[PDB]
């Protein structure tokens, strides 16, 4: 039996992170296997039957580009301890919002670093998309990180080269905020499979990776072991119920059926729930998911449930469903949050009122007051009431929603406490709610 963890793989376009993530899914999961089988067979043409997994991965890619593969983009693979839901971070600019308000926040981030001289340098650029992903991950609380230095075959498995890359990468991640001592550095070859699932025979000097954890020092040789060594995060099963609504249907013979993802707590038939910011209360008649009727919907489940005497008008997308007898959700007059300004063509002053995406809510909120400017990593206050915010700044801001809105402090309900700030056809900032005036 396996526990569930989410992983996001980040890196520069030339890092080779897709082949790397593809190798793990290929050898430890079951995604688009009928396409894989097709190409393993075709491979007999190359010679007398032998084939590199990377060759099969390349053909699988082109097949997907044609739009003829069958499986969806939800990818998973197994380790001895976990069933891992992995995301090979898209370079697509709209993925930024998705990374923030999208379901399945990462438990650990894997940074793939190309070992070549030119490639390495291009990847740790202060303005690189890779640094941004690392920053968003750190800001959203993804504290576990793993670093894989790929293409070790292109630099002949040279120890000094690997060591220098570990040094510079450490500096790179330290500036983001990660403590390098808690991060495993794994030299690999996504193409040849070195230290992927099995230890390499190309580097005698390689004694393995290691990391400091609160209980002691953990060691291993492969990327798979590093992933399997990811620490079990605690799930909000015992926190009160929170279920942001995605849709509301009126079904004949059944009634009102809202549908959404259980972010915290559990929804069961018989519970009396409340919908915020409306304030409507009612009993949960039944709960369904896919084809099964459930006795309970737990964190992560996208369920539909039937409730009586509530009108499809009365409740909508963006409303939050919670337990009326255990810290019921409420609307708010305002909320204060730590905002990190990403790179963008502009400057923020009090009064700025962009659209904020928080869970399933899409509401323009006013930057009513710029309370403090802070040192991003430590949180130490640098100045009271800054007069404006620019790219790179971390600050505490008071927000005033333009429409009834239900949010939560990141500390109590993570999925309802992080948000994306939209402007200029991009996500210009990422916020973490610190206090709420309910």
């Amino acid at each position: 039996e396996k526990s569930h963890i989410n992983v996001v793989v980040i890196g520069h376009v030339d890092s080779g992170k897709s082949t790397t993530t593809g190798h793990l899914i290929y050898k430890c999961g079951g995604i688009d296997k009928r396409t894989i089988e097709k190409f393993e067979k075709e491979a007999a043409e190359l010679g007398k039957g032998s084939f590199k997994y990377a060759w099969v991965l390349d053909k699988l890619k082109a097949e997907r580009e044609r739009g003829i593969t069958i499986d969806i983009a939800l990818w998973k693979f197994e380790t001895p301890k976990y069933q891992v839901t992995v995301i090979d971070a898209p370079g697509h600019r709209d993925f930024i919002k998705n990374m923030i308000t999208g379901t399945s926040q990462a438990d650990c981030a894997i940074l793939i670093i190309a070992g070549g001289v030119g490639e390495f340098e291009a990847g740790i650029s202060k303005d690189g998309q890779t640094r941004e992903h690392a920053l968003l991950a750190f800001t959203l609380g993804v504290r576990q990180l793993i670093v894989a230095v790929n293409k070790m075959d292109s630099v002949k498995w040279d120890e000094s080269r690997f060591q220098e890359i570990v040094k510079e990468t450490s500096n790179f991640i330290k500036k983001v905020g990660y403590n390098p001592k808690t991060v495993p550095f794994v030299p690999i070859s996504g193409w040849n499979g070195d230290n992927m699932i099995e230890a390499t025979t190309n580097a005698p000097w390689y004694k393995g990776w290691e990391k400091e954890t609160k209980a002691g020092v953990v060691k291993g040789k492969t990327l798979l072991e590093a992933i399997d060594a990811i620490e079990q995060p605690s799930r909000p099963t015992d926190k009160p119920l929170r279920l942001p609504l995605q849709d509301v249907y009126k079904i004949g013979g059944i009634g009102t059926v809202p549908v959404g993802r259980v972010e915290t707590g559990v929804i069961k038939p018989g519970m009396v729930v409340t919908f915020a910011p409306a304030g409507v209360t009612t009993e949960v008649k039944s709960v369904e998911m896919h084809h099964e009727q459930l006795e309970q919907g737990v964190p992560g489940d996208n369920v539909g449930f039937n409730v009586k005497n509530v009108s499809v008008k009365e409740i909508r997308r963006g409303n939050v469903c919670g337990d009326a007898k255990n810290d019921p959700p409420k609307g708010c007059a305002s909320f204060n949050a730590t905002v990190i300004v990403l790179n963008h063509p502009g400057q923020i002053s009090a009064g700025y009122s962009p659209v904020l995406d928080c869970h399933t809510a899409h509401i323009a909120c006013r930057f009513d007051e710029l309370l403090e400017k802070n040192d991003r990593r430590s949180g130490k206050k640098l100045e009271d009431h800054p007069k404006f915010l620019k790219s790179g700044d971390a600050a505490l801001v008071k927000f005033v929603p333009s429409k009834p809105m239900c949010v939560e402090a990141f500390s109590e309900y993570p999925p309802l406490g992080r948000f994306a700030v939209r402007d200029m056809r991009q996500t210009v900032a990422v916020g973490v709610i610190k206090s709420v005036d309910k």
């Binding site: 971070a89 898209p90 009126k250 449930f305």
Partner: protein, 90 residues
Amino acid sequence: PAAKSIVTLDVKPWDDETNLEEMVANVKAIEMEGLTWGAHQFIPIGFGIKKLQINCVVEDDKVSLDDLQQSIEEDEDHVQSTDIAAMQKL
């Protein structure tokens, strides 16, 4: 070659009686440079309701997913909303 991402969009109907075949036809009728429609299935989400789950591969620099979601949603007679079920780099 141009940077790409494979995306799986969930397109939700108004009720259990929404013509899903027309719904998927209207989505696939959407043409944009760098957009390739892929496989799709109608997945039950409970109480008789089925959602359209459809794959598409997009060129990052040419196809806005925000816009694509917004264009799909213009088909009000069939669509109540869309959500990104999952997305990966290619």
